[PDB]
Each structure stands twice: as structure tokens, then as C-alpha cells.
Design a binder for this molecule. Sequence first.
Ligand code: CU
Ligand code: CU
Ligand code: CU
Ligand code: CU
Ligand code: CU
Ligand code: CU
Ligand code: ZN
Ligand code: ZN
Ligand code: ZN
Lengths: 336, 336, 336
Amino acid sequence: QDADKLPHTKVTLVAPPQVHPHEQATKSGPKVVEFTMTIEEKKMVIDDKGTTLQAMTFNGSMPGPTLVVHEGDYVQLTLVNPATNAMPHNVDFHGATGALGGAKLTNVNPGEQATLRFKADRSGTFVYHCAPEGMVPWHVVSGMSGTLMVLPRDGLKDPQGKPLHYDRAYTIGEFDLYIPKGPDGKYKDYATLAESYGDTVQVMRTLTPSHIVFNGKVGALTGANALTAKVGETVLLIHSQANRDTRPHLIGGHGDWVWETGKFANPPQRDLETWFIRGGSAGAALYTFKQPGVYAYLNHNLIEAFELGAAGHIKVEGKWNDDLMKQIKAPAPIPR
Amino acid sequence: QDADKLPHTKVTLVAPPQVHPHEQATKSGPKVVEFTMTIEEKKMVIDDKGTTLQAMTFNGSMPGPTLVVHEGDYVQLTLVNPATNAMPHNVDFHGATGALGGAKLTNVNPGEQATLRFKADRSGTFVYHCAPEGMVPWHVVSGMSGTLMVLPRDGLKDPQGKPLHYDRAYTIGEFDLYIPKGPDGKYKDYATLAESYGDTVQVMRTLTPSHIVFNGKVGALTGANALTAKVGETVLLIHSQANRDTRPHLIGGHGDWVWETGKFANPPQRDLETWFIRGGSAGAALYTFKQPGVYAYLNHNLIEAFELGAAGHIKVEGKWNDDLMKQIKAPAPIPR
Amino acid sequence: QDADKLPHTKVTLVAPPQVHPHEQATKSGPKVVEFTMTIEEKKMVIDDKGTTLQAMTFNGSMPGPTLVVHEGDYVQLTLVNPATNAMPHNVDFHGATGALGGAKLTNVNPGEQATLRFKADRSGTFVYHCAPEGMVPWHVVSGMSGTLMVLPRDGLKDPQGKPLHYDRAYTIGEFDLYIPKGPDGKYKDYATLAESYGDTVQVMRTLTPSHIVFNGKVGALTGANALTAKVGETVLLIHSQANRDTRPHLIGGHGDWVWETGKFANPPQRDLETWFIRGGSAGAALYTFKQPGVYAYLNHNLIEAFELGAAGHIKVEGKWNDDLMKQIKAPAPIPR
Ligand SMILES: [Cu+2]
Ligand SMILES: [Cu+2]
Ligand SMILES: [Cu+2]
Ligand SMILES: [Cu+2]
Ligand SMILES: [Cu+2]
Ligand SMILES: [Cu+2]
Ligand SMILES: [Zn+2]
Ligand SMILES: [Zn+2]
Ligand SMILES: [Zn+2]
């Protein structure tokens, strides 16, 4: 026990899909790691036809940034709700024990801020999300979630206890969105956040999302914004879904080691084609690239991916390996 | 073999969320454990606006009571269908081998009763449900399911083979309900069970539940009816869903050890934030409370929980632990 | 490396639910295994009321046939798209590494054919499916998927490393179908494949299937077409779902050993009542029959099974075992 004896570090958060610099295995000791996050309500364009979402976010982004600590650290968050916002908010860390994830101790009306500490005594990727009483699903589906990664002190491990590592970490929040439609069957635009509410609840209750998006927008992780890697590189793909199940898949790739339930004291599974993230959870997959090219990373309900938007790209540099894959005969007429 | 050489015990069932008294590890030997259950059709109020369900139940409750035996025992059930009921019924134990779970050997018109025996040769929590030919989903979604827990003879075990135990067992049946609506868009009330049928089937086919409820009602496990524990206590949370997937989560807590597929010869997983119960199955989680307070136990599709009703509370007594969690700065104005 | 040094074998594919002859454990060495498949677009009757699907298939069947190799082999597929078809097509093997599963190297307009080779370096059942740019979900949901099983060289293994085997392999593709309805609320019939498109997309986007079917049709694996086994026999049930989650269950039976994620380097789970196939994946269960009779194999969302069609039968010959299950008292009046 006593956390007050311990050294402090301040961490500067970065925007998804990146994750702030951290060590995997560490020789360092339990610290009190300090973070600050600032809630921002805002309208966002979520697709290529100018449909908007009256959104709510931690730190301006969907998802919130990923916070990283080691098992044994103490997370200390200053949560700030500017008076420029319209709603109260709080925070529920699934990584934390007591007070409803910290939601009870972090209720912040606009103009307020609070500071929570909890011990990160359990390794894994864990969702955090806003949970204001009477209003939980709305705040979550409107964008208010992210990931806390608690790495084992000696870093990641395979089922045999052998070390595993990644060279690059990426963070993907998947967001099932419930955008209301007018009598004309066009999506509704709302002047304020409060005004989106009633109509939104009614779409939510149909359990049918209008949109399902990575990192805030259809196409968010495509084009200039595609993720990147090199043949030989190991990536950790962190995938959070605070409200609905999803099934990540890397087209042309695999999940070399996957913790689908996101909890690193458990052995991961290997060679996965498609894994499963349970709504209300974050999972983690390692992949070491072996072929160059553009890969698709997606929800493998293909409707949810291609029709609804749950899909991104990874652009991978390096040398083609004909042993792994070879075009023997290119497309050509069927021999007469 | 031969079951006829064996001693008999009669078990007196109790109503959910409690589970009848049983031993975990036992020095005792294979018995023929005798149970009796009586089907009851009845109208139930399922939410706080007086919406009713033309329900069908084992022993008067949703879910049915939980039956407990040890691996190697023989379950012997007398299933009674009173002439005061309108439908035939039977029973399908997923814990059992042959005759479609026992459904073929237990077809009981109103006024009849039958007695089934099967060997409980496989450990785990297992769903049982009514499965009358031509009418299976209807009977299941209208309430006719429950759990058979078959404990290992030497009790529960962690992945390393170390003993695990619970001090208190709770049983939660989650029920996706398909209540029809009138042209006025109000829920339909039906004078008889038979009359609910056609309209219900049509809602079912949309795969969109009107309600999703723990133990028969919205708010069933809240207020006076909240579950209870103490700091230091280990609870086993048994969660059945005979028809639809769900994703249990304990807010402010974890799944210390979880058998999401519900089968105790498999190693459980640890530190889970959210687990997954496959429709047609029962799972089991252990949690040892470390902080006092009211916890929410819920389906972490938050729409299904807060809008539709898949949520309950656990009221936990004891001493707050500031090491685990501490309000450093309560909500207060953002410093100018 | 070099695949060109290696011997070739030609495999003759068979129609589901059968799987072409293969060895489990093998003393043989890495070969280049050659397959050819021919795409066929066609109208199919999918239920007992003459509803049709403008379908697209590999080799004339839903699902495609199952291709079997051993870990270390090279799969070499000649994919043929006859000029009698209307669409371009390709193939994405989840078992393969690079070029989007091989989709990029296999784009075949009608009248063309291509040949792909990749190394099957990872054991498991893996989905393959057509993935033509701009048109992926449509081709997949209209029938274009199947399984590649890559067996370990020394065959299947339990979590302790002990050998496992099957005597009979069956392959089940489950297909969520999105059949449009007219203003009269009857299913739409389409003269051409291209004409089904726009309406189909709109049903897809509701994420509500009109039909969910094993192997192309409601009742496909029932009656004369039921699967078969004997008491004492071990079956491997391969279950693919290229687009949507499903939850296989064997009524009256179990999953003795189950790889729900379908990847044989992972330990399987035992005693499962219901397992979970993630959309975009194939899983595998072993079961050794202990009782004769007709079993139901189904998606245990019972609505999806009985209302929508995700259910088949297994007819099992042999001797009843009263130790496992016994009708103690048949149905008879409740004693006065
Ligand atoms: Cu909020
Ligand atoms: Cu939560
Ligand atoms: Cu019944
Ligand atoms: Cu069942
Ligand atoms: Cu195609
Ligand atoms: Cu795919
Ligand atoms: Zn590396
Ligand atoms: Zn205890
Ligand atoms: Zn055998």
C-alpha cells in the first residue's frame, strides 16, 4: 500500500491513432502517473455526405486518447469540464475498482474539474467512458470513450511465458452511431447538443446504427490518414468498443497474438483470422508484417464495414515475398 | 455405470436470484439427485409502465430456479404440467446427452407429468429450456429457461489447478422480450397466452427485442431487491441467456475468474472487464469485493442495459480503501 | 523457402456437406496442392415458399467446397470466371498472407481465369470469400464464401498435447440473406443478378436478415439430406460464417473439443453447450456420438434457427444408453 510515498510522472497525451511514448518491459517502479483530460462537446462531420453528429469527446477526439501505465502504477486523472460545454460529465475506468469505475467521484458540471486516483492493479487494455446518471448510453455513443492500457511490468508474454513486443502501437475506437432522419429521410442536423437527444434515444432503441465508424469518421483511417508499417515491424492494434460488439480482421494479415478480451494475464490466442471485441471492452492484437501493400483493417461484418463505415487501411512498405504468395498466372482468357 | 445401485437425495429448489444450498468440493459420492419442477403460465408486468408479458415459466419464476449437482451425479427431474396451463411443454437440458436434451422424453400436455433421469457427466453451468416441437423460440423467449450447475467433485479451479471458491451464488437469467405494439404504438395486452402468439412471432422475426430484462422485470434486481455482498466476500454470478448474446459487466468491479462459455474443465480467464454469454448458454464469474458501495451488474451494450432493462445492482457493505481508489480533488471550479 | 522444388498433388473437390478425402496426421511432406474452382452465378430457391435468391457461388454450391491441406503446404488455386457470368470476381483466403488475401491477384472478369499460390503456414479452418472492390458485402452475402482447413502436420491435438481425430468431417456454411420485399410485402423475384442489387443493399443496411440458412436453403440439412453418424463415431463439424456472428449448438450433444476461433495451434475448449463463430471466420468442433436418434445442429438464437432457417439434423444410428439418459416415468396424469 501507501501511494503517497511514491514518485510522480506527468504524461503528455497524444491523439489517436497514435499512443503516447511508453516502455513495455520496465526496470522502473510503481509511480503515480498523472494525466489531465478536457471534455469537449462539438459537432462533427461523420461521413462523405456531410452528415453531422452532435458529439461529445474526451480531449477533442473520438476515441479519447489512450492512457498507458504499468501494473502497480496509480492513475491520477484531472478531469476538466469547461463552462463552454452544456452537459455534466464524469469518468468510468474499467481498469479501476470502486465508486462505479470513478464515475461517482468525478461528476463535473460545466465550469468544474475533479481529480481521481486509482491503482491500476490489473493488466490489460480497459475501456474508460463517461457515465452520467440517467444519461449513460447517450454520452457513450456520442463519442465519450477511450482506452487505458496497463502493461505488465515485465511487458507482454506469449502462452509459454516468452517475451512479446510491438514496435508501433495504434489505437482504434469503433463507434456505433444513431443519427436520426427527417420525414424526407435525410439525416437530421441539430443546432445544439440538447436538441439531438430525444430523437437519438429513439434510434438507439432500434439497436440499428446509422453509421459505424473508426476514430470519428467514415474514412478516418484511410488515404493520407491510413496507418503505416514496414515489413518486419510488429504493431499492436488496440481496439475499443464501449457499447457494441465488433469483430476485427486484418485483410491479407492475421492476429499473430490476440487478447480478444484484452487482459494480459491471460494467454493470448494465435493465428486468428477475425477476433471479437465485446461491447464494453478493449482488446489488443499483435501483427508482424511480412508483405508490403495496402491492408484493410475492419469489422468483419462486411455490411458494418463497407456500408456503414467500420474500416481503415494500413499502408505497409517493403519487399514482396513470392514464397508467401505468388501470382502464378495473372487474369487471362479461359483457354479454348 | 449402473445408476440404480446409488443413494438418492431430494433437493428443495429456491427462487432466483438465490441458489439452493450445496457443497462446492465434496467428499461425497455420485448420487441420484431428485428435483421436481412445475410449469406455470401467467401474465407478468415487465416494466414500470405496466406493460405485460403473456409468460411461461418453470416454478413460477424467470429464470427457472438453478439446479446444482456434482460431476458424476444423476439428475432426476419430475416435470409437472398442471391442467391449469394451456400449452404442452417439455425440457431440454444442455447438460444432458441424448433425446434432444430430454425434450423427447418429457412432452407433457396440461394435466400430465413425466420423470427424466440423465447423468451429469460434464461440469459447467448449462442452460435448460422448454423445447416443444413447432414452438421452441416462443416458449424460450416467454420465460422458459434456467440453469443446471454441475460442479467439479473437488470444486472450482484456477488455470494452475489451485482451488477457487465462492461464499455466495447468485443466478441471473437475461430475457430478450418481443412485446407487440398496437396501431396506437402502445404495447398490446392479451387476455390469453394463445392470443399473444401470432403478433409475438412477428416481433421476434425483426430480431429486435422490445425489452431485455434480468429475472423477469426491469428493475428486478434493484432497490429492496438489489443483490448483496460484503468487502472480502466472493460471489459467483451465474448468467444464463437461452436465446440471445449478452455481455455481462460489473461496474466498479471485474470478473476475477470467468468461464464465459460456462464449462469448468476449461481454464477460466482473469481480470475481465466485460465477458460474453452466447445465446443458448450459461456462464459463471467469480468476484471478490474490495470496495463497499452500490455496483451495477449489466449487459454492456448500454442501450440494452439502460434503455431496455438489462441491468441490476449489488449493494456491498464494508470499508473504503483509498489505496485502490481516492478522490484527490472533489468537483470544484476550474482554477482561473 | 523455395516452393518450386516441391512435388504437386491435384485434389478433386467435393460438394458440401462432405469434405474431400484427406489425411489428418501425415508422414508426408510439404507439397504444392492444386485446386481449381469455377464461379457460378445462379438463381436459387432458399425456402419452402419459393422465395429466390439471385445468388453467386464458388463451384455451384453454398457454401463453396472446403479445401484441405496441411501446415507447410502451398495452396494453388485456379479461379475460373466463365463468360456466362455477369460479374467480375476474385478470392480472399484468410489463410493466406499478402495482397488482401489474394483478392488483388485474382480479379477475373467473365471469360477470364487466374492462378494464385500462397503458403498455408498457419493451421486452422479459415474462411475464403470473394472480395471485388466496391462490391464486397454483396458478393459475400449472395453466397460467395467457403473454408480452407489447414491441419497440423501431426494432426489435431487436445490442450495437453494428446492426439484427437475425427472419423467423418462435415462442412456447414451459414448464410445471412437479405431478400427485398415488394409493396405487397412479398419477397421480390429478379430476372437478373444486376437487378437485385440496389434493393438488396438497402435490406443489408438494416442489418436484419430475411433468412439465415445452412448450406443454401431452409431445410438443406434435413430429411433425406440430414447429416449422419453412428454411436462411437467422431465428427468434425466445420462451421463458416463469412459475414455475421452465429452460435452453433448440438441439441442432445456437446462440443467435446471446440476451436471457436478455428485456429488449431490454440488449445480447444471442452464440454461446450454452445460456441461462437465470429462473422468473417470458421470454427471447428469435434463430437463423439454416445446416443442414437435425430439431433438438431443449429444457431442457438432460436429465432434465427426456427423462424429464419439456421438449423439442420444429424441422424445417428446405434444403441440407446440408459445410464446416460433414462425415461423414468413417461408422460402420464398428475396423481390425484
Ligand atoms: Cu459525458
Ligand atoms: Cu462501462
Ligand atoms: Cu414450454
Ligand atoms: Cu437449447
Ligand atoms: Cu464475387
Ligand atoms: Cu474476409
Ligand atoms: Zn520488433
Ligand atoms: Zn471466500
Ligand atoms: Zn474415432
